[PDB]
Write a protein that binds this ligand. Structure first.
Ligand code: PLP
Ligand code: PLP
Lengths: 350, 350
């Protein structure tokens, strides 16, 4: 039923019989067809949500991690390393535990909320805090990949991009062709770069007639790609895309230019609106960063920038359960009422 | 495109052409073959984990809710209601949202933490806390469904049980035959009941060669089915199975006797151990209650009560992201080290 990602696309991936398949049955996620919004429905525009939140660790990063770790193990690596918290750390820790190797996470001795590393820790991640800054931490991470058999699994790891482009493969397999547009969040730009690589690869194989316009969106307070310059003070509630200087900058610009798409911004308020829309009207619960993709579609529709009768696919990068802080900001218990049927039906709106 | 759960097994479910399919592409969850544990390899036993945590809302509840809501709407219902929290409320809210109807959750004021219903609220759940106790909320919840166009989607909703039968169908479709043993958590016992009914249903069709032995497990502090009598004040860190009087008592007992299986208890300590094992060894992150199933396998293994060379399927009911409280609880961050390559490599264990 649910096969290993690398197995499903073995012929299209940099693997061989010598590649130890370290999988958690990631990928092959649901492509939920959305009912609306009505602004899209009235123009005959159909939306589909690639629910990447339904991956083993909760984010699409499992796609690149499964391959990155598999190749790392093939290369004889005793452990994978990254200089980040959140999903990347959680995914790396999970696959390292599956592979039976160590997962190293180097971070500055500063303040770190256990929420950002709790998941990676339960998996057995080796978190090391150093008396330095983000620069020193990422520096020590590299040197650790030069003096010891450690594989750096950060955003620039080629294998991560190779594995993440499979999402595009799955979309085409389901729809029968590439969509007209494809919206997704943009943090370090590795995912958008991979997406484009995927669609171009499927077109070169003859499995896709068209190439979609990549619609990447960033949070207003953290849109270095929109401003065309690094943002030394990234600000946004969408933690996953709180990036001031994307590692895959060049890749993002290329995908934007070649696909004839755009990389624009949406405010946190817009992100929160899309966040609620997906949950309350589509039944889809994703984290804010992911909602940004839907916020992007709302923006273009509002501007009438999406051709009618077109198909729009959105990559909801992470599951809502990933960020309880935002859920609690939106959630609220109503004032209690008397234990009477009349009062209940009233407060219920019946 | 991919056919929804209730359509995949339409011939085995009480649905028809007039049944409005309210789906979020739930089901078809991964069946991850576990590496161990060692105690299992020792006897040549094979364990497979049915990752129900990868369902739309994060729990297997979606299997029953997709059918419950679909039927409710077919019946003309304008909303569904329950007196639950956690996973049931979140699931009911998600599908209600998908269906475009209301999801009412009646709770006793002051008894429920915001976190326990945050997910449902994000989906637009209409929470109504009454000035009384669970008995009052439970009482007027059914009264609400009697006086108004609201379908009751509580534990005993026959459709929720029928929909949960599909999990067994999927296990057989992939393995080719039913496993020798099938362990899972036991709260209201509606799931273990559904599992059994699903297995003997596929067996009556010829799709399943044999019938598995249902191995149900409860937390020691909340094991009414193990003690053979209700538990006034059930207690355990596994909130999902913290039930003192299972609504499906009878169904669970029958499934136990008919399958020649068991319904035993495991301590919270044992649950946490399995919890850590799955994540630290298999790379699978599930919530405490789900880990109870694995803790049970460990138990029967120590007691040498599992036939060697046998296949064991574990239903991991919910995803670990469902309980950030526990994950951060067992979490631990070691003291910082100097920003020297020799310091990091050492702390990491290189
Ligand atoms: C990593 C991540 C992103 C950002 O993707 P980039 O490839 O870094 O652009 C967005 N959302 C979630 C949930 C993520 O885990
Ligand atoms: C609902 C639930 C259970 C209990 O299942 P029952 O059918 O009540 O026995 C166990 N674990 C999780 C994660 C659940 O959501």
């Amino acid at each position: 039923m649910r096969p290993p990602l690398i197995e499903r696309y073995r012929n299209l991936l940099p693997v061989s019989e010598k590649t130890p398949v370290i999988s958690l049955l990631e990928g092959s996620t649901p492509l939920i067809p959305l009912k609306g919004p009505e602004e899209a429905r009235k123009k005959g525009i159909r939306l589909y949500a690639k629910y990447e939140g339904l991956n083993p660790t909760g984010s699409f990063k499992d796609r690149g991690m499964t391959l990155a770790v598999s190749k790392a193990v093939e290369g004889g690596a005793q452990a994978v390393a990254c200089a980040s918290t959140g999903n990347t750390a959680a995914s790396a820790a999970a696959y390292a535990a599956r592979a039976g190797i160590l997962a190293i996470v180097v971070l500055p001795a500063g303040y770190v909320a256990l929420g950002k590393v709790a998941q990676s820790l339960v998996h057995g991640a080796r978190i090391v805090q150093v008396e330095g800054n983000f620069d020193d931490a990422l520096r020590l991470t590299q040197k650790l990949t030069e003096a010891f058999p450690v594989a750096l699994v950060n955003s620039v790891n080629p294998h991560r991009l190779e594995g993440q482009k499979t999402l595009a493969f799955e979309v085409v397999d389901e729809l029968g062709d590439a969509p007209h547009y494809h919206a997704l969040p943009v943090g370090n730009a590795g995912n958008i770069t991979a997406h484009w690589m995927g669609y171009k690869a499927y077109h070169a194989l003859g499995k896709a007639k068209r190439l979609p316009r990549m619609l990447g969106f960033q949070a207003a307070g953290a849109a270095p790609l929109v401003l065309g310059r690094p943002v030394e003070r990234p600000e946004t509630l969408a933690t996953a895309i709180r990036i001031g200087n994307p590692a895959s900058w060049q890749g993002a610009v290329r995908a934007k230019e070649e696909s004839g798409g755009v990389i624009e911004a949406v405010t946190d308020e817009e992100i929160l609106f899309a966040y609620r829309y997906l949950a309350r009207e589509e039944g889809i619960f994703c984290e804010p960063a992911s909602a940004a993709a839907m916020a992007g579609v709302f923006k273009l529709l509002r501007e009438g920038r999406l051709e009618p009768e077109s198909t729009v696919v959105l990559t909801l990068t992470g599951h809502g359960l990933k960020d309880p802080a935002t859920a609690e900001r939106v959630a609220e218990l109503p004032p209690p009422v008397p234990a009477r049927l009349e009062a209940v039906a009233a407060a219920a709106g019946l």
